[PDB]
Curated annotation (Swiss-Prot):
The active site is at residue 495. Kelch repeats lie at residues 182-227, 238-280, 282-331, 395-449, 451-503. Coiled coil: none annotated. The gene is GAOA. This is Galactose oxidase. Optimum pH is 7. Active from pH 5.7 to 9.4. Monomer.
Length: 639
């Protein structure tokens, strides 16, 4: 199940309008309180007019609207189930503006929801863009609108939340499709659950930022239920999904052909492991005792060229284990892995002990010292985040998490780790005064300007429960070594939530739950628009445009020349990300040194070390003097 974020508004004085309604299935049958009566558009003798179909409500009075619910027909028939939809709010019933929520609902008879940020309105409109099974009709058994206890206008300069993207699944795992710019998401064998899996199936859903279209696909070709996996984007640009519900499987997503290809089985069966793309384009993985059994799972490496997995038994997992109360089942999970120089992989945590992993021969491991500062030794930070915001300077920001995976208090601990050469112990310091809010199960992304956006989580880790939620996101600004609170949201994002940086510079935050009959399933996502996209007047700022690029494929050490429509002051390369269970080993940022050729013509060199400039797809962002970024131009980097 799921749940609304607000309280049901009294429907006694409501006036409703529908584009069409069959006799016996009147527009008002959707607000009569009878679950067995429904509104249904024209059919039979009246003909079968295709979508869009609309349901408009006049609430007579202004309400602080934060959602709606839609109960479909409960008679066992599927005709009219709403698929793609849009929700609009208004104060006059004439001017509707932009949708406060849009997307698609799953094809079943369960109550569907649209949860969004509070907005005062008198009129509500639900537009059915498509029927769930492509049929011409629209039907609704019961429709309700919800309200918050109050409304507080967002603070100027602290970004904005909205709109909500309604989904047919809980997006517990996600990635940005490089060549299409779409957000790929997946759950498990079911749209709302993972338990009781027969294996061999994954339900996926994609959202296109340019069209707003949500599409789905059931993946069975790879014979893999991709829930709880390791995720990496290889040197060629294929998404390598490993283990999970089907512990020994590897599934490959190809962006260019928009298809899933069967990959080679891993040498060891794993679940909850972290995988990381290397300097040579290969993928390294270690640990992962959630599935496949609880035992010593050392490293192994994937080669995209030969489509093989090879064991690296001497790349020992023992040095990176946390002291989790639940033991090995949890202690080898979600390592903070980063591909580095000469085929090495840095492990920043969650364990206090940081390590260097080597991939030559049968593998090796070397101690990199303990994550610490002048404030003391950092405790184990399970499900804490780690973000490489400046790969050129080897800067990694780590924050949050708890000593144990569950039933443990999260902390405000935050550190800055500075990587040097492989085998050397990196210098580590405390980041500012730490987080404003202690949190675990939170997610994060590095933004074009080098700042790190942190959102969601809870003060005490209790998987599948929406207790002690943190609604206020935080942004770390490196130049000032300061954290800044942003405008809060209204949807709890805890266990099974994700965050990814979109090609337009905004943040996609969603998921949470995936517990079947629980009421904590969140079949949605929200868009966060950072302050850098707004001008002083509170309106969306004019963005600089990249009018031309010399090439879209470059080798490390190579140069790229661009043309713009206006003057730019700064530029950066951000590697496309992947995300699940707080892990994102693909994203990283490279600040660029620009050469002004005169006028609106610029050049830059991609770092020569492929350990810094990890091969694969990257987003090119250019910022003007005001700090407003352009939309991303896609660049492929090779070693
Ligand atoms: Cu999980």
């Amino acid at each position: 199940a799921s749940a609304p974020i607000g309280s049901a508004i009294s429907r006694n004085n409501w006036a409703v309008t529908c584009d069409s309604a069959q006799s016996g299935n009147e527009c008002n049958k959707a607000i009569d309180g009878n679950k067995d009566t429904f509104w249904h558009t024209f059919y039979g003798a009246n003909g079968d007019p295709k979508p869009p179909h609309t349901y408009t409500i006049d609430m007579k009075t202004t309400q602080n609207v934060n959602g709606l619910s839609m109960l479909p027909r409960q008679d066992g028939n599927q005709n009219g189930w709403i698929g793609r939809h849009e929700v609009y709010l208004s104060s006059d019933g004439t001017n509707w503006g932009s949708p406060v929520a849009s997307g698609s609902w799953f094809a079943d008879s369960t109550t569907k929801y649209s949860n969004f940020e509070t907005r005062p309105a008198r009129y509500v409109r639900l537009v059915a863009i498509t029927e769930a099974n492509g049929q011409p009709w629209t039907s609704i058994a019961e429709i309700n609108v919800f309200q918050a206890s109050s409304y507080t206008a967002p603070q100027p300069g602290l970004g904005r939340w909205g709109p909500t993207i309604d989904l047919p699944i809980v997006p517990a795992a996600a990635a940005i499709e490089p060549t299409s710019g779409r957000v790929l998401m997946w759950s498990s064998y079911r749209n709302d659950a993972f338990g009781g899996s027969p294996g061999g199936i994954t339900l996926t859903s994609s959202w296109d930022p340019s069209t707003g279209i949500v599409s789905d696909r059931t993946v069975t070709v790879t014979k893999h239920d991709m829930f709880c996996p390791g995720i990496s984007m290889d040197g060629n640009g294929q998404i390598v999904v490993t283990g999970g519900n089907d512990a020994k499987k590897t599934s490959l997503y190809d962006s260019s052909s928009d298809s899933w290809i069967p990959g080679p089985d891993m040498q060891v069966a794993r679940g909850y492991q972290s995988s990381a793309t290397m300097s040579d384009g290969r993928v390294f993985t270690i640990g992962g005792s959630w599935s496949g059994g609880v035992f010593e799972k050392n490293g192994e490496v994937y080669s995209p060229s030969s489509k093989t997995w090879t064991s690296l038994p001497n790349a020992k997992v023992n040095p990176m284990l946390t002291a989790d109360k639940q033991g090995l089942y949890r202690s080898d999970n979600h390592a903070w892995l980063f591909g580095w120089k000469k085929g090495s992989v840095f492990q920043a945590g969650p364990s206090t002990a940081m390590n260097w992993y080597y991939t030559s021969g049968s593998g090796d491991v070397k101690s990199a010292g303990k994550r610490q500062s002048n404030r003391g030794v950092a405790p184990d930070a399970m499900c804490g985040n780690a973000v490489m915001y400046d790969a050129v300077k080897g800067k990694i920001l780590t924050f949050g998490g708890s000593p144990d995976y569950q039933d443990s208090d999260a902390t405000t601990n935050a550190h800055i780790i500075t990587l040097g050469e492989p085998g050397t112990s990196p210098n580590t310091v405390f980041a500012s005064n730490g987080l404003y809010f202690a949190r675990t199960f939170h997610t994060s992304v590095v933004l074009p300007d080098g700042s790190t956006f942190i959102t969601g989580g809870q003060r005490r880790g209790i998987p599948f429960e929406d207790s002690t939620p943190v609604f206020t996101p935080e942004i770390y600004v490196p130049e000032q070594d300061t954290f800044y609170k942003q405008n809060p949201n209204s949807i709890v994002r805890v266990y099974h939530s994700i965050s990814l940086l979109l090609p337009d510079g905004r943040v996609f935050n969603g998921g949470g739950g995936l517990c079947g009959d629980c009421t904590t399933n969140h079949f949605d996502a929200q868009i966060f628009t950072p302050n850098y996209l707004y001008n002083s007047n509170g309106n969306l700022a004019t963005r600089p445009k990249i009018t031309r690029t010399s090439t879209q494929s470059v080798k490390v050490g190579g140069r790229i020349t661009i043309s713009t429509d206006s003057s730019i002051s700064k530029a950066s390369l951000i590697r496309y990300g992947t995300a699940t269970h707080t892990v994102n080993t693909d994203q990283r940022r490279i600040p660029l040194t620009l050469t002004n050729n005169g006028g609106n013509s610029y050049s830059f060199q991609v770092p020569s070390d492929s350990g810094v400039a990890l091969p694969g797809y990257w987003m090119l962002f250019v910022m003007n003097s005001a700090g407003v970024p352009s939309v991303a131009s896609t660049i492929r980097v090779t070693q």
